[PDB]
Design a protein around this motif. Sequence first.
Motif, PDB file in Angstrom:
ATOM      1  N   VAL A 143      -2.552  -5.373   1.639  1.00  0.00           N
ATOM      2  CA  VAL A 143      -3.494  -5.145   0.537  1.00  0.00           C
ATOM      3  C   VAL A 143      -4.424  -6.334   0.372  1.00  0.00           C
ATOM      4  O   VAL A 143      -4.001  -7.490   0.102  1.00  0.00           O
ATOM      5  CB  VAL A 143      -2.834  -4.765  -0.777  1.00  0.00           C
ATOM      6  N   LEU A 153       3.607   1.041  -2.012  1.00  0.00           N
ATOM      7  CA  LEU A 153       2.237   1.353  -2.276  1.00  0.00           C
ATOM      8  C   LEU A 153       2.297   1.894  -3.697  1.00  0.00           C
ATOM      9  O   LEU A 153       1.724   1.341  -4.639  1.00  0.00           O
ATOM     10  CB  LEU A 153       1.592   2.309  -1.198  1.00  0.00           C
ATOM     11  N   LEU A 194      -6.412  -1.999  -3.092  1.00  0.00           N
ATOM     12  CA  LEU A 194      -5.436  -0.932  -3.259  1.00  0.00           C
ATOM     13  C   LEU A 194      -6.120   0.422  -3.417  1.00  0.00           C
ATOM     14  O   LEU A 194      -5.690   1.491  -2.916  1.00  0.00           O
ATOM     15  CB  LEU A 194      -4.629  -1.208  -4.530  1.00  0.00           C
ATOM     16  N   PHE A 226      -7.060   0.959   0.153  1.00  0.00           N
ATOM     17  CA  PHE A 226      -6.059   0.710   1.166  1.00  0.00           C
ATOM     18  C   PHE A 226      -6.259   1.478   2.420  1.00  0.00           C
ATOM     19  O   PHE A 226      -6.531   0.922   3.480  1.00  0.00           O
ATOM     20  CB  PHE A 226      -4.630   1.028   0.694  1.00  0.00           C
TER      21      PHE A 226
END
Length: 242
Positions: free
Chosen positions: A13, A32, A50, A53
């Motif tokens: 990340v 995640l 994120l 991602f």
Amino acid sequence: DDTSSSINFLTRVTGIGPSAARKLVDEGIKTLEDLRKNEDKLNHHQRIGLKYFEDFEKRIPREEMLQMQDIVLNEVKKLDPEYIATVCGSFRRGAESSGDMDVLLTHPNFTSESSKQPKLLHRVVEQLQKVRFITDTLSKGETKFMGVCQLPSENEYPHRRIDIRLIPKDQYYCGVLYFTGSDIFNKNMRAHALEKGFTINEYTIRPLGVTGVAGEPLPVDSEQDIFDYIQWRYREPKDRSE
Ligand SMILES: [Mn+2]
């Protein structure tokens, strides 16, 4: 054990650096999904990375990469044609696919004497954003902007990373070179130059002397002059693999 595996994933990340990845684990934040449910423990960066991602993981084909470069090149041109913008990296070197974009930018108004002109950058960052090129921001500084972008569709594209840097006009070339690479080519070039009595870095090319402790930056107005200083035939970007 099935945890080291966790710290690693974290670092996958963008934003989440190691020491940062660790504290997150201490909250039990590992997957995640552990992130997603916990946007509050994260900075704008980490949150952005994120958010993206998946797309961040994919690569850019040059068909796209180019179309991207068109957009950046064109917009800066309409804000002020005195704006020089070279999108560098492996890409410049003909690479078939790329990881991220990185536009290098300058303006004669800005030299290593002023250093205070973020509007120079900003203006484009903003410009890029009104077009919906850049679509998010990771971290917008005075001389550098880390952000996200995406090409337009009519029905879609991943969000690539994009970096735009502001460099003095008196150091652009050296940096255009340096962010051009490859890492090897720089080594060798930097290695050659050293022999002729020169030291090239990302900013300047200085002449050496006795006991090394020396330098005083030669003027540079194209990448070409670098090469001339050290008399090596200019190797086009495509020939800079090694
Ligand atoms: Mn980058």
